[PDB]
Amino acid sequence: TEVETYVL
Amino acid sequence: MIQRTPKIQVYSRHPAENGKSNFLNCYVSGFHPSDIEVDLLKNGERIEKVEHSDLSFSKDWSFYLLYYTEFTPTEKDEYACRVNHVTLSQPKIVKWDRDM
Amino acid sequence: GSHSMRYFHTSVSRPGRGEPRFISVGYVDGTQFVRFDSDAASPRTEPRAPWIEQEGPEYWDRNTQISKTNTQTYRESLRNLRGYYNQSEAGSHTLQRMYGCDVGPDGRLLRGHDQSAYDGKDYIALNEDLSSWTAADTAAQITQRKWEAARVAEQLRAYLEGTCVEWLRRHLENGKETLQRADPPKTHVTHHPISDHEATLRCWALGFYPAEITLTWQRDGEDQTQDTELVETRPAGDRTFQKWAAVVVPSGEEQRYTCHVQHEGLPKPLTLRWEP
Ligand SMILES: [Mg+2]
Ligand SMILES: [Mg+2]
Ligand SMILES: [Mg+2]
Ligand SMILES: [Mg+2]
Numbered sequence A: 001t002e003v004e005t006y007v008l
Numbered sequence B: 001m002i003q004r005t006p007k008i009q010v011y012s013r014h015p016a017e018n019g020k021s022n023f024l025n026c027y028v029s030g031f032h033p034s035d036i037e038v039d040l041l042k043n044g045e046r047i048e049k050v051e052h053s054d055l056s057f058s059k060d061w062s063f064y065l066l067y068y069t070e071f072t073p074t075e076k077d078e079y080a081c082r083v084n085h086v087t088l089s090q091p092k093i094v095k096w097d098r099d100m
Numbered sequence C: 001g002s003h004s005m006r007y008f009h010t011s012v013s014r015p016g017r018g019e020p021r022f023i024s025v026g027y028v029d030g031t032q033f034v035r036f037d038s039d040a041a042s043p044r045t046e047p048r049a050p051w052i053e054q055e056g057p058e059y060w061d062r063n064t065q066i067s068k069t070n071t072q073t074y075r076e077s078l079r080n081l082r083g084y085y086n087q088s089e090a091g092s093h094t095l096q097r098m099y100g101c102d103v104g105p106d107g108r109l110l111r112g113h114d115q116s117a118y119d120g121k122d123y124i125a126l127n128e129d130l131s132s133w134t135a136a137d138t139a140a141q142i143t144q145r146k147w148e149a150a151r152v153a154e155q156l157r158a159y160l161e162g163t164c165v166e167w168l169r170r171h172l173e174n175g176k177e178t179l180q181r182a183d184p185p186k187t188h189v190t191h192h193p194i195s196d197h198e199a200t201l202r203c204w205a206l207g208f209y210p211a212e213i214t215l216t217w218q219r220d221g222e223d224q225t226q227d228t229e230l231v232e233t234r235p236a237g238d239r240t241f242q243k244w245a246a247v248v249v250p251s252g253e254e255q256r257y258t259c260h261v262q263h264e265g266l267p268k269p270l271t272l273r274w275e276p
Helices: C057-086 C138-149 C152-174
Strands: B007-012 B022-031 B036-044 B063-071 B078-085 B092-095 C003-012 C023-027 C033-037 C094-105 C109-116 C122-128 C133-135 C188-191 C197-207 C214-219 C241-250 C257-262 C270-272
Touching: B007 B078, B007 B092, B022 B036, B022 B078, B036 B063, B036 C057, C003 C057, C003 C122, C003 C152, C023 C057, C023 C152, C033 C057, C057 C094, C057 C138, C094 C152, C109 C152, C109 C270, C122 C138, C133 C138, C138 C152, C188 C257, C197 C214, C197 C257
Parallel strands: none
Antiparallel strands: B007 B022, B022 B063, B036 B078, B078 B092, C003 C023, C003 C094, C023 C033, C094 C109, C109 C122, C122 C133, C188 C197, C197 C241, C214 C257, C257 C270
């Protein structure tokens, strides 16, 4: 499963 | 902006045998940005309904795509790939040569 | 041997043409197994290899939700980046991210990855310690400060060492017949006269998987790196890869040249010559 990424 | 022009290879999936159905591939890689136009040509005319792979990229962040379709090599027919990209002033045509 | 799971994310703004497209593709080694595209008529994480199809609805639903959230996050990131670089609203820009994990032959974590690029240039990366960042410039230092404040590295380390490795091991078992099968190259040398004085010898490697391969020419036992034309390894479209290496040789000297091939699927490395 993928990860939720974080805003730059 | 710094941009990167595509490398182009045109080739068959299986070894070419005249009159035997095969797949014609045009692999474009090394380019940035990601927008790119690729046509496969048979005797200079665009082949319809060519499929392509999902956009991805290499470790250096440059993009790659594979465009492909069924084809049957013959002595009489010529195949090619035609690519356009922001880095190119005119479309670039690479002919299929079974020795490469 | 060793294996990797990697996700490749591309987001591309297009002012005047709607919101930035986001595409995610997932791979185990050289095999793509999922895609998600915000430009699809019905965006959804979709299977791209047969062995992932057995995953149940929870996997498809959870990955689609993550990807839909990621679409929004990347669009916010692209707005922020245009500001960090003082750029116009007129231009198109690209944000890419790659992340995932590598395991060794026994399934143990070798290392994790999470790194981003803006307009094709490295922007910020998680260091191999999974605990600190390397920012490329003063814009990425803004992102680094934000991620330090929010303890993002700790969240990514937990994912990379936990979820990522567990899923890679699950995929490797479910796809063991393909993912854990190395297909050796089929190899041969062709000869192409150029003139009365010279000919090309081309050493071919066809049908191999995974794509890592060593293909070189030697003359009298010395590597010919500067004189070899080596094409990029290219996909055949049937999971396998192709590559060739060519050297221009003086007519009559063909037997001084040997092609050398190493690949995981071969019981022993190969030496080949032109066989007229
Ligand atoms: Mg152009
Ligand atoms: Mg846009
Ligand atoms: Mg931007
Ligand atoms: Mg980029």
